[PDB]
Design a protein around this nucleic acid. Structure first.
Ligand SMILES: Nc1ncnc2c1ncn2[C@@H]1O[C@H](CSCC[C@H](N)C(=O)O)[C@@H](O)[C@H]1O
Ligand SMILES: [K+]
Ligand SMILES: [Mg+2]
Ligand SMILES: [Mg+2]
Ligand SMILES: [Mg+2]
Ligand SMILES: [Mg+2]
Ligand SMILES: [Mg+2]
Ligand SMILES: [Mg+2]
Lengths: 71, 150, 326
RNA sequence: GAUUAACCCAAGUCAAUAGAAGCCGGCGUAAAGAGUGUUUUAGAUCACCCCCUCCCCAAUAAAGCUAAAACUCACCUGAGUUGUAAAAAACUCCAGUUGACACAAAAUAGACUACGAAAGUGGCUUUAACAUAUCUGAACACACAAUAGCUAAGACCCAAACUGGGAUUAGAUACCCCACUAUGCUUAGCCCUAAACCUCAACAGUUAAAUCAACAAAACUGCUCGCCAGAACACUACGAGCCACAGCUUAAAACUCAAAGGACCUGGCGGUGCUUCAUCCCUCUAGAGGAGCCUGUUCUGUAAUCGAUAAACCCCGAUCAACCUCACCACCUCUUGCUCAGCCUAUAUACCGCCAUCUUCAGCAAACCCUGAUGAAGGCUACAAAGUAAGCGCAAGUACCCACGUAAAGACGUUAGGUCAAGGUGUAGCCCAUGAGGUGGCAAGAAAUGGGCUACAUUUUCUACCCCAGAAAACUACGAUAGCCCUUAUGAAACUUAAGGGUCGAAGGUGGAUUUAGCAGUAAACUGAGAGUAGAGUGCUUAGUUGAACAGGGCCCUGAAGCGCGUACACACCGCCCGUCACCCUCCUCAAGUAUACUUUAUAUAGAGGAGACAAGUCGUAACAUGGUAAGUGUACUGGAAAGUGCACUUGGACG
């Protein structure tokens, strides 16, 4: 059989890799911002949980870990 | 075609086996002749060439060709006559060198026709001084209209 | 002012010195000649050119230097006999300098019709009328057949669409004679959709007129640049002193190919842009050259700097080859 | 669009929008079996009857070992070695021999088809070891998962992206050469991808029907899980998860299209394979291409035809132009005219008529029959296997001198081939003129080109003769059928045409690529006659005389035929397709500044990217032919990009 579908997939992948290479720095900055927003939203969800529970503050000895950071 | 190719291969194998065995002939066994090619139309055999020893090998092969054909008839019994061709690389070169030793020598741009174009230009100086294509499957036919009309 | 391209490297490769014979077959503006005279004042230089204006500039330099520089008006083919009668029949030329292309004064003048930017008669003739019987580009386009014009544009012009542009030119010429350079440019533009006027881009990746290549082709065919260049190279080799320095500048692929194949003794009929695989296949098919006569000063070509490209974009494609007669 | 007419419905008609009706169908190649195994909650009946898989292989992990080869080292010897298409560069403590010598890789066996869940696994030994006495059971749980890659530490013979150098190239890169790195190796982690493909889910059963869209790989049934619902957007965006940070898994929508796609058939094509051919090339003879002239065409000129015009025009219509012919031009004249008018006015791309071309062919088209499941299509084997009775052509017969040869014949079809100027004719046009008649006139060469004649001589020239001769033989030679002059023939008309004489003795000195013709009474040479004219050709037709040489060798080129292979082309390779390109449209994503929000984010628009379309071609020629360097998957590096290369895998390539 012909490889027209395979060729189209190859061209699409080549274009996508070229686009990633062209704008990898902007993509990295956007991803870092998204990770920051992710962590902030997760912390806000936990805060909402313990606020609805009635506790005036977080439980003693509890600190929300940075689960969305490479470090 | 493929059957003839297999027949050529079988003939090559049989001739090689006859050459290798000593039972066919002490002379042929001692020669240790090796075949470059075997092709059936008559059968043409081509053996690699090593002059004096080459001539001796050719003479012995020509002498023993009849016995080789007789032995092949024992096996493929209807075997056409076998022709041995000595492969002196390019045999023309060998024969030419032999004759030359025998022979006597006696005492010792732009890719265009710019001229034609220049002539044509001088001649000129002297004389001075798409659409739509309908698909084949969509063409109307009025035969049915005529048949229904009458 | 279009400064002579890589004139410093030309001076370096030639290395002018006192009491040496140097022939400039393409005097033209003379910037190379002026730099050479700046390096050495006692050098005996020959300024050969086909443009009568170039001969006038050479005579002006002769007014500056009465006999240090010697003018000469004529083509490369005539150059052999001209120099033989001049007094350099035994050759012994200490240096030879061969530029190529269009002189700055030639290109600027619209009357010569060397540029599509400025209108003028479709002359495209380096000769300024010294031989009025010499064909002009207008006569070339009006006279030559469809196949002849297509071959001219394909070979000389390195044009992909010769079969189309030649037919368009013939169709236009059948209505009116093609006597204006801008008229020819408009005709060639009409051979393609208007958006394709500047789609073709230079080696500098800068937009150029689509007709430019065509213009180039006509220029060459008007002046027989390839054949006359080959004759000039042969005459220089005949007249060059053993150990003399030959420096050439080539502004396009065809002339550079001719110069390189002459220097390396390669057959001119050999295929172009050969790869190693193609050479291996050729030799396998042939498996069943003349002795070298030059020593290359520079094995690889020398190209102008980016700054020189910005200063003189016309000289970007110039490639310099320096050798010594052996 | 208008108009006529017709059709459907009808106090309605029907433009838009919305709704009505739903997946018991499938998953090798079309969307779809996801790289692999296990189990859970469960489901199935294949768990009972009901039976056989320990044996012998290359599963895995660990430890140890080494035969061939390499590197290094040492001695001896040599001065070169290595390298290529050819070289250069490189090395010259380089090479060869001998000896010592591995954390690398595992010839032959292996033509075996084994082990493992898959990936994978092929040197030796040892240890440990290859789950389950019903099946099914997961993108995510559990555990694996080639190559590439990351992190760290080692090893490093060799190979090797990248890099440097050398060549090659117009040039850069690549293909080639050399050096060398990451990397391939070990240890410990990570990454979790593939054309992970037997492109066939697991288990059980069947070979009876209908065997079956096609191809692949015989067709199915039961059961279970997974998956798919037009193409593209999209192995993408967002969200989420991940040791991943240019990543992987899951995975959309808007705008847009009427197709996209799978298999096959026929044709075209292949820088397609093989085989065999011909005048395709060489071989033989005489020519053309150089000169003069004849003639034809073309161009110029003129007031001044037309047609043919690549083979298949070019001494062609013409078997023939001073007037006539004549259709051209100028001037003049006529209008029911020679014609119950006329036109040589347009259209050979409306035709008849007559032909060119392949054809120096052998096939063509009907009428049937059969095969493929009654798909497009196909239909041959002579010791014959679905083709065929007739027609046309070849053939046969006939003409000439035979039975040979030459003529003649030569179908269908190809080139809208030629002819509206043989004549006829369709359509269109002219009618005080595009019709008819009269007088007069072209017709020259500054040229180019085609064919022919005569030559350049000694195998010749002149004379005699019709083949036993004598002279000539280079500036008083050979060589004009040319020019000039004068006669003559024909004619009413002749420097025009022809013949003859005189005069002149010119160019030329066997002619380049290239090109024509011939296969035997042929080529070559010589001579006569005829058609046609009042006369007129170096033309045409035809009779005859003299009368040869080579007849072999080849497929590189050209072309043909056959058997094949491939085909994304069908406007049929000057094809198609892919990527590339500042600028208007549609759609998505999206940072700003300021309102709300708790100070970042949320939350209301707006730079910038992406998708599609647009004038579209330009640019590259990557893909489709062995598509010009087989294609492709994964991954990595380099490059602005077009891409290139490394490693493994796939055949959805080929082959002694
Ligand atoms: N065959 C030939 N004979 C003589 N001159 C020639 C020539 N071909 C080209 N030329 C001339 O060479 C020159 C090329 S460009 C001149 C460049 C000049 N050296 C300078 O000073 O820049 C023009 O003058 C052109 O007319
Ligand atoms: K093996
Ligand atoms: Mg795409
Ligand atoms: Mg299970
Ligand atoms: Mg892995
Ligand atoms: Mg290494
Ligand atoms: Mg595999
Ligand atoms: Mg399963």
């Amino acid at each position: 059989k012909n490889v027209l579908k395979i060729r189209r997939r190859k061209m699409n992948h080549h274009k996508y890799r070229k686009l990633v290479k062209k704008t990898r720095f902007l993509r990295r900055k956007v991803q870092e911002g998204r990770l920051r927003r992710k962590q902030i939203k997760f912390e806000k969800d936990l805060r909402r949980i313990w606020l609805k529970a009635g506790l005036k503050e977080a439980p003693e000895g509890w600190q929300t870990p940075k689960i969305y950071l490479r470090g | 075609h493929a059957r003839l190719r297999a027949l050529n291969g079988l003939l090559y194998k049989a001739l090689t086996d006859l050459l290798c065995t000593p039972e066919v002939s002490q002379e042929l066994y001692d020669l240790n002749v090796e075949l470059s090619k075997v092709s059936l139309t008559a059968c043409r055999a081509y053996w690699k060439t090593t002059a004096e020893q080459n001539a001796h090998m050719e003479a012995v092969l020509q002498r023993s060709a009849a016995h080789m054909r007789h032995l092949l008839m024992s096996q493929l019994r209807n075997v056409p006559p076998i022709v041995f061709v000595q492969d002196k690389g390019n045999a023309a070169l060998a024969e030419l060198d032999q004759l030359l030793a025998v022979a006597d020598f006696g005492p010792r741009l732009c890719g265009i026709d710019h001229e034609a174009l220049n002539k044509q230009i001088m001649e000129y100086k002297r004389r001075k001084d798409g659409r739509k294509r309908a698909k084949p499957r969509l063409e109307q036919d009025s035969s049915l209209k005529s048949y229904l009309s009458g | 002012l279009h400064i002579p391209v890589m004139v410093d490297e030309v001076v370096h490769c030639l290395s002018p010195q006192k009491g040496q014979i140097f022939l400039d077959m393409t005097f033209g503006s003379g910037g190379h000649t002026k730099a050479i005279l700046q390096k050495e004042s006692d050098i005996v230089l020959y300024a050969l050119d086909r443009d009568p204006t170039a001969y006038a500039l050479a005579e002006h330099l002769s007014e500056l230097y009465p006999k240090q520089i010697r003018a000469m008006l004529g083509q490369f083919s005539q150059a052999e006999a001209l120099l033989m009668k001049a007094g350099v029949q035994p050759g012994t030329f200490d240096g030879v300098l061969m530029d190529l292309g269009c002189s700055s004064m030639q290109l600027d003048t619209p009357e010569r019709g060397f540029s599509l930017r400025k209108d003028g008669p479709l002359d495209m003739r380096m000769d300024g009328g010294r031989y009025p019987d010499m064909p002009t580009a207008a006569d070339v386009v009006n006279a030559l057949d469809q196949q002849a014009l297509a071959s001219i544009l394909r070979t000389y012009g390195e044009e992909k669409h010769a079969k189309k542009i030649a037919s368009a030119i013939v169709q236009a010429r059948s209505i009116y004679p093609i006597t204006r350079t801008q008229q020819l440019a408009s005709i060639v533009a009409g051979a393609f959709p208007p958006s394709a006027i500047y789609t073709r881009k230079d080696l500098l990746q800068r937009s150029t007129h689509i007709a430019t290549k065509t213009f180039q082709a006509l220029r060459i065919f008007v002046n027989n640049e390839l054949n006359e260049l080959y004759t000039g190279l042969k005459t220089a080799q005949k007249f060059l002193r053993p150990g003399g320095r030959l420096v050439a500048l080539s502004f396009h692929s065809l002339e550079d190919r001719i110069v390189k194949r002459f220097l390396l003794g390669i057959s001119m009929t050999e295929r172009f842009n050969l790869s190693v695989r193609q050479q291996v296949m050729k030799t396998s098919q042939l498996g069943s050259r003349a002795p070298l006569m030059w020593e290359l000063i520079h094995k690889k070509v020398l190209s102008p700097q980016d700054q020189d490209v910005q200063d003189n974009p016309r000289g970007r494609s110039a490639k310099l080859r320096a050798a010594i007669k052996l």
